[PDB]
Amino acid sequence: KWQFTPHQHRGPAEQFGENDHIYSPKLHNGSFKSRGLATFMGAPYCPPDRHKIREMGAKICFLAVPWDQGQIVRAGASQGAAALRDATTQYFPYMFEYDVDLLSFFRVVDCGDVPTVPGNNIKSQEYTADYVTECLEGGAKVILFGGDHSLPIPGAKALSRFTGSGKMGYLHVDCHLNAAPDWAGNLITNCSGAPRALDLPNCNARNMAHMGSRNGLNPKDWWDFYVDNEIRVVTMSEMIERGLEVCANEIFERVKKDTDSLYFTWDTDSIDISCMPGNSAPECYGLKGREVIQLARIAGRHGCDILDIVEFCPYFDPSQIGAKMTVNMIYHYLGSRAQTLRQQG
Amino acid sequence: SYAHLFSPLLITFLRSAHVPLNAEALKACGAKYAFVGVPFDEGNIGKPGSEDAPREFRLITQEYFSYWFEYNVDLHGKAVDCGDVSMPKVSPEVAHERIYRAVREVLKSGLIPIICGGDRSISITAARALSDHIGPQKKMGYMHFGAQLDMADSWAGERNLAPCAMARITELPNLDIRNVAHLGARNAMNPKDHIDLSKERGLQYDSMFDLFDAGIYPLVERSIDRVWSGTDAQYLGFNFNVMDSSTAPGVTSTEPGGLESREMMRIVDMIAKRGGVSVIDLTELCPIFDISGTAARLAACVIMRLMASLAAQDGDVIDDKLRRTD
Amino acid sequence: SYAHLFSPLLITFLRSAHVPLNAEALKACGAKYAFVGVPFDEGNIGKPGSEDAPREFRLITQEYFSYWFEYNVDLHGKAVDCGDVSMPKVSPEVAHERIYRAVREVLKSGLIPIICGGDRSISITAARALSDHIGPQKKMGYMHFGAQLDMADSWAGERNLAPCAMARITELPNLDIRNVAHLGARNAMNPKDHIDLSKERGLQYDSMFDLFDAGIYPLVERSIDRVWSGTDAQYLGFNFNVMDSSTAPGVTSTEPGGLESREMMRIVDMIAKRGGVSVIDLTELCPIFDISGTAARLAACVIMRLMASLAAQDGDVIDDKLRRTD
Numbered sequence: 001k002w003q004f005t006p007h008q009h010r011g012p013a014e015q016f017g018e019n020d021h022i023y024s025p026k027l028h029n030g031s032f033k034s035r036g037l038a039t040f041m042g043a044p045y046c047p048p049d050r051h052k053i054r055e056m057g058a059k060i061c062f063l064a065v066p067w068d069q070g071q072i073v074r075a076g077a078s079q080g081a082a083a084l085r086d087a088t089t090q091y092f093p094y095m096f097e098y099d100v101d102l103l104s105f106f107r108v109v110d111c112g113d114v115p116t117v118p119g120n121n122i123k124s125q126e127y128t129a130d131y132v133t134e135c136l137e138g139g140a141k142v143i144l145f146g147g148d149h150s151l152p153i154p155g156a157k158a159l160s161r162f163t164g165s166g167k168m169g170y171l172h173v174d175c176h177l178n179a180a181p182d183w184a185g186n187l188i189t190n191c192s193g194a195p196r197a198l199d200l201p202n203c204n205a206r207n208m209a210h211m212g213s214r215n216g217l218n219p220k221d222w223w224d225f226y227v228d229n230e231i232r233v234v235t236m237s238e239m240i241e242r243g244l245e246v247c248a249n250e251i252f253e254r255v256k257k258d259t260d261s262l263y264f265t266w267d268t269d270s271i272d273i274s275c276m277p278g279n280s281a282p283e284c285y286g287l288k289g290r291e292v293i294q295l296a297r298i299a300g301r302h303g304c305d306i307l308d309i310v311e312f313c314p315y316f317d318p319s320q321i322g323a324k325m326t327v328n329m330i331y332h333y334l335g336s337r338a339q340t341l342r343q344q345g
Numbered sequence: 346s347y348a349h350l351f352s353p354l355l356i357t358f359l360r361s362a363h364v365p366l367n368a369e370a371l372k373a374c375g376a377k378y379a380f381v382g383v384p385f386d387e388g389n390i391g392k393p394g395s396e397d398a399p400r401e402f403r404l405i406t407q408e409y410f411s412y413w414f415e416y417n418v419d420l421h422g423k424a425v426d427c428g429d430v431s432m433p434k435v436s437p438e439v440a441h442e443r444i445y446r447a448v449r450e451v452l453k454s455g456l457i458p459i460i461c462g463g464d465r466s467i468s469i470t471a472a473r474a475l476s477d478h479i480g481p482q483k484k485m486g487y488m489h490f491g492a493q494l495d496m497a498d499s500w501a502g503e504r505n506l507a508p509c510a511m512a513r514i515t516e517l518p519n520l521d522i523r524n525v526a527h528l529g530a531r532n533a534m535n536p537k538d539h540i541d542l543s544k545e546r547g548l549q550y551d552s553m554f555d556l557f558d559a560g561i562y563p564l565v566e567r568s569i570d571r572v573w574s575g576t577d578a579q580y581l582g583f584n585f586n587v588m589d590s591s592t593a594p595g596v597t598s599t600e601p602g603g604l605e606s607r608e609m610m611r612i613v614d615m616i617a618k619r620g621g622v623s624v625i626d627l628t629e630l631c632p633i634f635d636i637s638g639t640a641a642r643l644a645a646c647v648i649m650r651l652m653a654s655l656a657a658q659d660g661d662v663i664d665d666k667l668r669r670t671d
Numbered sequence: 672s673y674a675h676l677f678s679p680l681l682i683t684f685l686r687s688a689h690v691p692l693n694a695e696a697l698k699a700c701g702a703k704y705a706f707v708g709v710p711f712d713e714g715n716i717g718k719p720g721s722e723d724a725p726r727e728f729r730l731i732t733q734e735y736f737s738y739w740f741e742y743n744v745d746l747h748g749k750a751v752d753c754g755d756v757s758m759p760k761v762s763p764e765v766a767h768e769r770i771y772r773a774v775r776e777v778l779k780s781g782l783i784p785i786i787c788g789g790d791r792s793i794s795i796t797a798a799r800a801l802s803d804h805i806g807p808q809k810k811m812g813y814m815h816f817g818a819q820l821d822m823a824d825s826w827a828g829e830r831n832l833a834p835c836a837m838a839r840i841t842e843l844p845n846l847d848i849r850n851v852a853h854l855g856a857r858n859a860m861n862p863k864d865h866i867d868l869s870k871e872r873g874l875q876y877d878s879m880f881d882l883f884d885a886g887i888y889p890l891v892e893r894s895i896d897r898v899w900s901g902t903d904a905q906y907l908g909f910n911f912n913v914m915d916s917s918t919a920p921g922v923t924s925t926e927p928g929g930l931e932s933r934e935m936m937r938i939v940d941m942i943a944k945r946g947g948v949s950v951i952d953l954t955e956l957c958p959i960f961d962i963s964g965t966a967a968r969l970a971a972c973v974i975m976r977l978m979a980s981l982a983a984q985d986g987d988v989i990d991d992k993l994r995r996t997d
């Protein structure tokens with residue numbers, strides 16, 4: 001069931017060593033120069049189906065959600081998952097910073113993409129929730145890769161349903177406050193992740209938080225949402241003044257306190273435009289490169305049930321910097337998660 | 346109506362109204378700032394592109410909303426846009442004459458000119474305009490951010506190209522050298538005579554290395570005090586090559602080892618604490634060299650945040666209790 | 672004449688003179704450094720493009736003035752350009768033999784080679800050339816900045832490709848492991864066998880995480896001391912993927928969460944305090960991935976600032992009393 005070829009290539013120069021994927025390639029160059037038929041991390045493909053996932057014993061499902069027609073700004077995020085997958089060919093699945101083989105530790109699988117129905121945000125978001133449900137019911141935690149910032153609407157819906165009578169936290173890291181009650185009447189655009197989460201029956205204001213906001217793409221009602229519902233916001237300014245570790249640790253304690261599950265949506269426009277030009281609405285005065293990795297590390301120490309990463313648009317980046325930053329956001333989350341689990345026995 | 350503060354139910358700075366470059370129209374329109382485009386580059390001895398900056402900068406500003414939640418300020422109505430100073434080509438004498446007239450004309454209105462170049466030599470004439478506006482019995486101060494001192498007494502036989510700009514500005518008779526700041530100079534585009542003239546005239550520039558050595562903000566605060574203390578008018582100018590290359594690629598002459606955007610945003614707040622400014626310039630944006638409009642966006646956020654921080658200082662804030670359901 | 676110090680009235684490094692790869696000619700020319708282009712990319716295991724780096728790097732350096740006011744040093748005359756090593760395509764062993772002979776020849780002159788790739792495997796051969804040059808009775812030190820350890824004993828069955836570079840360099844017989852430094856290693860392009868082989872040999876690498884936990888400079892100092900204290904010659908190399916992606920996009924394998932421009936410029940000064948270097952290399956610039964030349968321009972500034980800082984340490988400064996219009 002759960003099988004992959006180290007360094008990808010089959011045929012006459014196939015490698016078969018059980019740990020060959022954490023070492024320098026032996027018979028050939030693997031996919032470091034030419035991508036071939038690369039999955040995320042070179043992991044096994046596994047359909048997003050609770051039976052297949054269960055049978056493989058996968059504990060992490062990577063699922064792309066390229067849907068980019070749920071948004072108010074500009075399309076493009078549909079193309080990000082392919083750049084992300086391609087970027088994973090420039091890395092091993094072994095992280096020396098954590099001494100972890102991510103691929104065998106979690107039995108990661110790539111579940112391919114969530115299908116879309118163009119022009120139909122309602123049905124596309126239903127597909128997304130149904131697909132995320134399979135991964136959860138299969139016994140895995142999930143990494144969801146957007147796609148526009150409508151993603152946490154079906155994402156959190158699915159985790160909420162799965163969590164049942166338990167309680168769920170929601171964390172949102174974004175340049176933008178994304179708390180439109182509606183946008184020109186529409187309740188489920190990329191502008192309403194946080195209000196739609198508060199509407200879930202087992203998601204409570206005391207376990208919700210926002211970090212990373214700044215600048216003037218933030219109508220007043222988006223701020224009023226947090227004031228009126230008593231939901232903590234840590235602005236980019238506060239994170240700089242008080243310090244990332246201090247703020248992040250407070251916020252993770254907040255969103256995990258007496259919860260059974262945590263949803264964490266991370267917009268790539270939280271990252272400074274200097275490190276992330278490839279974005280639907282990029283912004284100065286954001287996270288620096290080392291801070292992105294530190295936040296990922298901190299998130300991995302605390303743990304979440306679904307991590308989503310959204311709004312990466314590779315058409316607007318001529319380099320590999322955007323795609324490789326998104327790899328690192330995931331790989332440091334997982335690396336730190338495994339180190340933490342292992343230390344906990 | 347306050348509908349524009351909230352999620353919904355002509356190429357001008359901030360989508361602002363146009364008002365002609367006319368003191369009386371400007372005085373009557375109700376705005377506090379007047380945007381003026383100056384697509385002039387005959388002072389530029391480097392790579393071309395600054396002439397398209399005013400258009401690119403306007404367009405970037407059209408993407409933000411007028412409300413700045415960090416400050417509880419709305420900018421709607423605070424600015425208007427006078428269009429561009431119209432210039433003949435290869436005609437530098439007469440270009441400067443027209444720029445001078447335009448800035449005198451805005452100053453006469455009482456509004457604050459936001460002057461967008463174009464190349465850095467336009468500062469010479471905008472500064473001379475403010476000098477003449479206030480006159481010989483008032484005191485001016487001047488602060489400029491950039492990687493180059495521009496302290497050439499002459500360059501290639503000329504006296505009003507961009508590399509002479511500070512050599513001309515520091516000659517203005519009501520600008521005492523002690524009320525002059527220059528922040529960010531670094532790297533090699535600074536010939537020895539630029540240093541020698543500075544030392545001769547007592548220009549206390551803050552080199553980028555001086556700044557980093559001091560933790561930045563303490564030395565900035567000192568140089569703000571020199572420019573704003575005991576002065577009747579203050580001129581503030583930006584070349585965004587003061588920023589690190591990664592942060593502002595689309596400028597005429599990028600330089601590694603500059604400011605981060607977070608440090609400039611704190612510096613804007615420190616300036617805003619003094620509760621006013623007489624002229625604001627930005628020159629040497631170069632949008633053909635820009636990626637995802639990074640430099641233009643950085644510049645737009647700096648200018649808009651300075652407007653918003655000044656409004657917050659003046660207590661000119663929105664009513665906190667307004668809600669979309671009104 | 673000193674006209675180049677002041678405001679004014681072949682593609683080569685710093686617009687320097689061409690001088691043949693000839694020990695006698697180089698010794699005579701007056702320069703201290705000799706630039707050697709090495710557009711070889713057949714040790715590259717990753718994305719293509721480094722072949723174009725020597726050209727693009729040279730072009731950026733031609734934009735600079737020669738005088739650095741922060742050091743009071745003039746770089747005019749300090750370098751010459753020996754052109755590119757003549758190398759066959761599809762014949763790496765012969766290419767590497769040509770590089771070897773080019774490097775020994777510059778070293779024979781007493782000038783410091785500045786070697787620009789091209790891929791990281793060229794360091795193997797340049798480092799071997801320095802090892803052999805100084806001989807069995809001398810001690811070498813080696814310091815390299817990069818995000819990758821490059822400690823593959825073998826890669827695809829091959830022994831002299833880029834990811835093998837440190838595995839070969841640390842085998843040089845007059846390079847004690849105690850005199851080796853590697854700074855910046857991070858992220859997942861660092862497989863377990865590179866870590867194992869490092870541990871086995873006692874390579875005391877300073878990972879990016881180790882550097883941040885230390886506030887950078889206290890740990891860099893300790894490693895500079897290991898390389899310079901008690902060695903006869905020192906090899907200094909750069910892969911600019913040691914830098915944060917933001918300030919080095921145009922490299923073979925860009926990496927987030929690394930050094931920023933101002934931190935590397937401080938490191939350069941700390942190195943210069945030791946008063947000499949034997950060889951300088953830079954590899955894996957990759958212009959097809961660059962954002963407005965950002966990486967190439969950071970590289971250029973690093974290299975030129977190291978030359979200037981070193982001259983300042985040596986008291987090779989300009990007469991301050993010198994003035995323009997002389």
Ligand SMILES: [Zn+2]
Binds near residue numbers: 174175267311
């Ligand atoms: Zn966003």
